[PDB]
Amino acid sequence: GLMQFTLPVRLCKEIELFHFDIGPFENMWPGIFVYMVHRSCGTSCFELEKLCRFIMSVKKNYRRVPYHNWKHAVTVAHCMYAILQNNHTLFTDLERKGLLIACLCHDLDHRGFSNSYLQKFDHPLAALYSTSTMEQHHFSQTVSILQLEGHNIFSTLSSSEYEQVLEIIRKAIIATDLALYFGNRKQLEEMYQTGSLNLNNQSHRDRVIGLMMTACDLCSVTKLWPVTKLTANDIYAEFWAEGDEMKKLGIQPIPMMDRDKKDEVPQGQLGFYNAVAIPCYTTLTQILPPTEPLLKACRDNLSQWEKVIRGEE
Ligand SMILES: Cc1ccccc1-c1cn2c(n1)C[C@H](NC(=O)c1c(C(=O)N3CCC3)cnn1C)CC2
Ligand SMILES: [Mg+2]
Ligand SMILES: [Zn+2]
Numbered sequence: 001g002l003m004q005f006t007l008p009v010r011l012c013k014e015i016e017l018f019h020f021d022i023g024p025f026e027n028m029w030p031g032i033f034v035y036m037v038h039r040s041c042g043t044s045c046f047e048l049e050k051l052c053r054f055i056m057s058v059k060k061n062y063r064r065v066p067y068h069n070w071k072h073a074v075t076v077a078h079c080m081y082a083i084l085q086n087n088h089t090l091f092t093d094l095e096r097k098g099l100l101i102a103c104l105c106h107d108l109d110h111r112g113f114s115n116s117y118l119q120k121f122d123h124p125l126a127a128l129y130s131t132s133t134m135e136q137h138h139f140s141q142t143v144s145i146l147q148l149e150g151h152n153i154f155s156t157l158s159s160s161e162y163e164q165v166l167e168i169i170r171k172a173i174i175a176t177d178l179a180l181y182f183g184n185r186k187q188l189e190e191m192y193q194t195g196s197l198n199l200n201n202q203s204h205r206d207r208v209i210g211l212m213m214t215a216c217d218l219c220s221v222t223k224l225w226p227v228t229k230l231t232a233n234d235i236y237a238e239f240w241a242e243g244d245e246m247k248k249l250g251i252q253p254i255p256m257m258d259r260d261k262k263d264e265v266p267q268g269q270l271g272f273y274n275a276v277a278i279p280c281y282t283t284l285t286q287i288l289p290p291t292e293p294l295l296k297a298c299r300d301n302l303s304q305w306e307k308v309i310r311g312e313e
Pocket of ligand 1: 217
């Protein structure tokens, strides 16, 4: 009860900033997450014994893939932490509980392959879940781990609160399917501009939470340039592996996944910042003004990719 987690001074200060990098010391990441839960939610939200057992089971169920790994999980939970801390009063006690856990669990048991590759391979998960294939798997893995003896961190919630938190987590995890992001942001853009956006409307909050999940999931684009640049290497290590596997199935992959077209990465990055990242953080900044530092860091990185094309780096 009276046991806090305490970070070294540099981490204690920088963890509050949107652009914090969680560092290369894996053994500190669990403590960083508990620190964020305690400050974001309270030291009472979860039994520490159960949270620690949940965190370590979640870690064990992430694989050793270049990008969709345990570091990504914690990184995405930190961006959510930064959004929740800068928007103190806008979110219910249940939402703060659910969303950090959603972010930690959102890519559970990822193999480093897209929903497209699962479908073309004819992987069993593609038979079980026809759309948002991996994302339904991630939520399913989350429920499994919550039901391990000693792992139910929500046990002190009432039955209805329990049903509400699992519904927040489910929608939050499904929303990380980038195919669903385009239509979700368009709807939110319309609602904000015609002034119909109403955060007491549950279907509207769902949409806003969905956009928060895209923002946290993509947050490598909101870091210092060297973090952004080095994360992109890991993202392409997965994409090019998938392209290799597409070739093995006798299918030429899209240029994004074809290691033979590395040369065009910078232009692909521009398309992505213009089509996905900038519009995401722009609408997010309109709805939640204190998340502006994410939009500003994203535009800075767009500028860095423009400089790469111009041969200046
Ligand atoms: C057109 C092209 C030609 C030649 C070479 C490359 C490209 C190209 C097109 N695109 C990209 N490269 C990367 C971009 N996606 C990211 O950069 C990305 C993700 C992300 O899409 N997801 C899914 C799982 C992670 C997460 N964060 N970031 C930064 C998507 C579009
Ligand atoms: Mg995912
Ligand atoms: Zn993710």
